[PDB]
Structure 1
Amino acid sequence: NVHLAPGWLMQLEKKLHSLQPHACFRLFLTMEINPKVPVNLLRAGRIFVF
């Protein structure tokens, strides 16, 4: 339900960009299609429409 937190989504994207995960880290953002989602977050993720 990450769409419930629009600004926190942008903050999460900012944290993700300046970071070096482990070779198997995988962040999943289950979400509902909504215009509230940041454009940068959409650009920085592998979208899966369900």
Structure 2
Amino acid sequence: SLQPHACFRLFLTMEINPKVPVNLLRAGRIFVFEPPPGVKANMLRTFSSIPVSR
């Protein structure tokens, strides 16, 4: 029920729980964060997360 600013993003962080409303699941865009598949992907995310200057 609102029309917001252009550069406004609302971030909802939650655990995977059936109690989350289906209305909110349909309205929002869903991102799933999981342990990585594979040692290569694990090391890739570790190296991307650690800044280069460190």
Scaled by the length of structure 2, the TM-score of the pair is 0.60
What percentage of aligned pairs have identical amino acids?
100
C-alpha separation in 1, matches of 2:4 and 2:17: 28
Aligned structure 1 segments of 4 or more residues deviating by more than 2 angstroms: none
Letter in 2 for 1:47: I
Distance in structure 1 (CA, Å) of the matches to 2:22 and 2:30 = 12
CA RMSD after TM alignment? 0.4
The structure with more helix, counted as a fraction of residues: 1
Unmatched tracts of structure 1, length 5 or more: 1-17
Query: Normalized against structure 1, the TM-score is what?
Result: 0.64
**Structure ranking higher on relative contact order (CA contacts 8 Å, 6+ apart):** 1
Q: Of the two, which has the highest radius of gyration?
A: 2
